[PDB]
Amino acid sequence: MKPACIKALTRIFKISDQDNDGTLNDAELNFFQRICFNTPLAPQALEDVKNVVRKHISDGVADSGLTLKGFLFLHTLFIQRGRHETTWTVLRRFGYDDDLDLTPEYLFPLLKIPPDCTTELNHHAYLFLQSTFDKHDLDRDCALSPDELKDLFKVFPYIPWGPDVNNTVCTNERGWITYQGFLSQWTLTTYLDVQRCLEYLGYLGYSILTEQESQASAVTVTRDKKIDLQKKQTQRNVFRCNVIGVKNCGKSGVLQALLGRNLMRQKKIREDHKSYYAINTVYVYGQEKYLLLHDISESEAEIICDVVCLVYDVSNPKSFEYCARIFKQHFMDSRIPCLIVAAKSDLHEVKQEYSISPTDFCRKHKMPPPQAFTCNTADAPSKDIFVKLTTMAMYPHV
Ligand SMILES: Nc1nc2c(ncn2[C@@H]2O[C@H](COP(=O)(O)OP(=O)(O)O)[C@@H](O)[C@H]2O)c(=O)[nH]1
Ligand SMILES: [Cl-]
Ligand SMILES: [Mg+2]
Ligand SMILES: [Mg+2]
């Protein structure tokens, strides 16, 4: 029949196939019937349907589970008809309108975020994404190969992730998005563009599979930053840090260090797949938090953060002046914590040409001492600065 209807039903099947085995078993079938038609068929009434399929087509029932061809056959057996309410009942249940398109109410639910508030995923939202990952990790490598990513995006109308995502979150030795990196990308997406995240949850059928009113049920909205500073206490799990410094001072090296990549692996990164964001889990005093690094290129929007990482290059006499300049310019009379990082510590330190030395600058403006850092290590770079950067974002008042 009409290709648009078949494409919609095909996607619905995929969403309904929660174990991604290519068939709908009795457990998945009953769930489907319950959300579409209130009540599932009796165990024998189900094998009656399966028999009807078996007598017409041979590839409609496999492991005593309904295949896509059998699913389409049913709706086709359902399409001779009069019968047309039952297919449309399924279509409407999965957010489609009369033109076989996902409704705006389904894809873009209303979610107002007050100023200076951030968006995170609740515990149940994460558990859904964890299930989503395992569903498509059919090789159990705890990573999504390009083929498995392609499989995951088959419910998407477009490819949601570019090749720069692999340079934004944790990947394995061959550049494949890790289970933890998968969660990080979703964490990153919810924080920066919650509207985009909700839309992606719609394509995955979050509200349907988890039986909630809207995709917005997955999002937790943190309280006002002003209150966090007043109470001197926050409940946020995700903190953003702006990385600021002159060109070629090693900012990109810092972001990639958070992902556990040393300098030479970073030299394997294609320039067209470069990312100006990096996010990974960080432990602070036994607490697991998310650190969100944003590489600010040297050029109110790009200053909003929970902590500032002022990076300078020790092999560059001109570099530290920028950190001083920007600090005085925007962060001197601010309650946002600042940390100075002496990047490229592996290189020979050159005398900085600023009027005051980096060390005394920190003590005068009552900042922590300049933090030595290098992403040029034999193994993975140290995550010390990231723990410290996160600790300061959690406790600015210290
Ligand atoms: N020796 C050494 N070189 C580094 C380090 N980090 C970056 N570099 C080099 O500095 C150059 C620019 O680094 P990059 O991070 O891209 O600078 P950015 O413009 O601030 O992002 C690159 O060619 C790197 O090879 C480091 O920790 N040690
Ligand atoms: Cl730059
Ligand atoms: Mg199945
Ligand atoms: Mg895999």
Side-chain angles (χ1 to χ4, degrees), residues 1-269 272-273 275-398:
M1 292 295 180
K2 230 53 161 199
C5 181
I6 297 182
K7 199 180 80 169
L9 291 178
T10 298
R11 177 180 165 266
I12 290 179
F13 181 87
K14 179 80 175 183
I15 296 182
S16 301
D17 188 23
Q18 307 185 37
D19 69 336
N20 204 80
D21 65 323
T23 57
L24 306 180
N25 55 24
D26 303 82
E28 289 162 349
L29 276 179
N30 291 333
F31 183 86
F32 177 85
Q33 300 173 60
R34 184 177 59 85
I35 60 178
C36 290
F37 313 128
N38 296 330
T39 171
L41 288 177
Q44 159 146 20
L46 187 52
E47 257 283 309
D48 286 327
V49 180
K50 294 182 183 176
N51 283 330
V52 174
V53 179
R54 289 193 189 104
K55 113 149 166 185
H56 285 73
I57 64 180
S58 63
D59 45 11
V61 184
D63 324 307
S64 192
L66 188 66
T67 68
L68 173 58
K69 297 184 175 180
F71 181 76
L72 299 178
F73 160 76
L74 284 183
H75 288 281
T76 297
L77 174 72
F78 286 20
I79 204 179
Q80 180 287 333
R81 130 118 59 82
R83 309 168 203 245
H84 210 167
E85 279 333 283
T86 172
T87 298
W88 276 111
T89 308
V90 170
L91 290 166
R92 220 161 292 136
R93 184 60 189 96
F94 282 76
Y96 287 99
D97 66 340
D98 264 26
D99 295 298
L100 300 169
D101 303 324
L102 290 181
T103 60
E105 293 74 26
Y106 175 84
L107 276 191
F108 315 107
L110 184 59
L111 188 62
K112 134 195 174 54
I113 298 97
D116 305 282
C117 293
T118 61
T119 45
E120 301 177 2
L121 294 163
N122 57 43
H123 179 60
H124 293 291
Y126 275 107
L127 290 181
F128 173 80
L129 296 176
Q130 293 180 6
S131 176
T132 304
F133 179 89
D134 302 336
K135 166 174 181 180
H136 294 87
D137 187 31
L138 302 183
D139 49 25
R140 313 152 30 244
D141 58 346
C142 265
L144 288 187
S145 65
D147 288 332
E148 295 178 338
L149 277 177
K150 165 166 118 102
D151 183 31
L152 171 59
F153 298 155
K154 240 139 60 181
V155 289
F156 286 74
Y158 55 84
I159 301 301
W161 296 352
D164 60 319
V165 170
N166 300 72
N167 299 320
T168 310
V169 299
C170 282
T171 56
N172 57 17
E173 71 286 351
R174 298 179 66 247
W176 290 357
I177 300 179
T178 279
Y179 169 85
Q180 181 52 229
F182 182 83
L183 300 177
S184 293
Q185 172 59 28
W186 281 98
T187 302
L188 178 75
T189 308
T190 308
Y191 190 95
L192 296 176
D193 193 334
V194 57
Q195 297 79 15
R196 175 168 301 199
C197 172
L198 294 186
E199 180 189 348
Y200 289 171
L201 291 175
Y203 297 138
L204 284 171
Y206 168 81
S207 60
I208 305 162
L209 287 168
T210 65
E211 289 180 301
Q212 307 230 41
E213 280 161 33
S214 66
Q215 325 293 349
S217 302
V219 175
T220 299
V221 178
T222 62
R223 71 178 175 188
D224 201 330
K225 183 70 174 184
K226 298 138 190 315
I227 306 181
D228 283 340
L229 301 188
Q230 164 225 14
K231 291 289 190 300
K232 291 190 294 184
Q233 171 179 341
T234 185
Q235 295 302 128
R236 299 185 172 186
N237 297 322
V238 190
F239 303 92
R240 173 170 48 185
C241 169
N242 288 332
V243 185
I244 301 175
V246 279
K247 183 67 180 295
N248 215 74
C249 77
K251 291 185 301 302
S252 171
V254 178
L255 269 70
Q256 289 301 323
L258 180 64
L259 304 186
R261 303 179 186 173
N262 56 28
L263 177 61
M264 263 291 325
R265 183 181 295 275
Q266 296 174 30
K267 283 311 192 68
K268 311 281 175 181
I269 305 303
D272 57 320
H273 300 343
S275 179
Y276 289 96
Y277 280 95
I279 174 179
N280 195 25
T281 60
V282 165
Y283 278 104
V284 174
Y285 294 134
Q287 313 176 27
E288 179 178 87
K289 302 290 183 180
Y290 272 99
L291 177 62
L292 202 158
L293 296 188
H294 185 20
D295 180 21
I296 308 292
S297 295
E298 182 190 3
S299 47
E300 140 172 342
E302 294 85 357
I303 63 179
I304 296 300
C305 61
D306 304 312
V307 57
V308 188
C309 185
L310 293 182
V311 182
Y312 80 96
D313 184 6
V314 293
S315 64
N316 198 33
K318 23 159 68 191
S319 74
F320 175 74
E321 181 272 313
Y322 195 79
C323 300
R325 185 202 311 183
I326 265 57
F327 176 79
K328 303 176 111 64
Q329 202 177 77
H330 291 280
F331 304 112
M332 171 172 289
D333 291 336
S334 177
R335 287 174 102 67
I336 298 183
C338 291
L339 187 74
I340 291 191
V341 169
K344 308 191 193 176
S345 78
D346 62 289
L347 301 178
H348 161 63
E349 183 177 1
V350 187
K351 172 199 142 35
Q352 292 298 324
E353 294 177 354
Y354 191 58
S355 52
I356 188 183
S357 71
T359 305
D360 318 317
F361 188 92
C362 292
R363 224 54 175 155
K364 157 190 216 170
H365 300 292
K366 303 167 184 190
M367 299 185 304
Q371 304 296 318
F373 171 79
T374 170
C375 69
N376 190 20
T377 57
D379 311 276
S382 180
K383 287 187 172 61
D384 285 345
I385 58 167
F386 307 122
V387 176
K388 191 164 182 55
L389 280 169
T390 307
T391 312
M392 296 170 60
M394 296 178 57
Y395 310 104
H397 37 276
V398 177

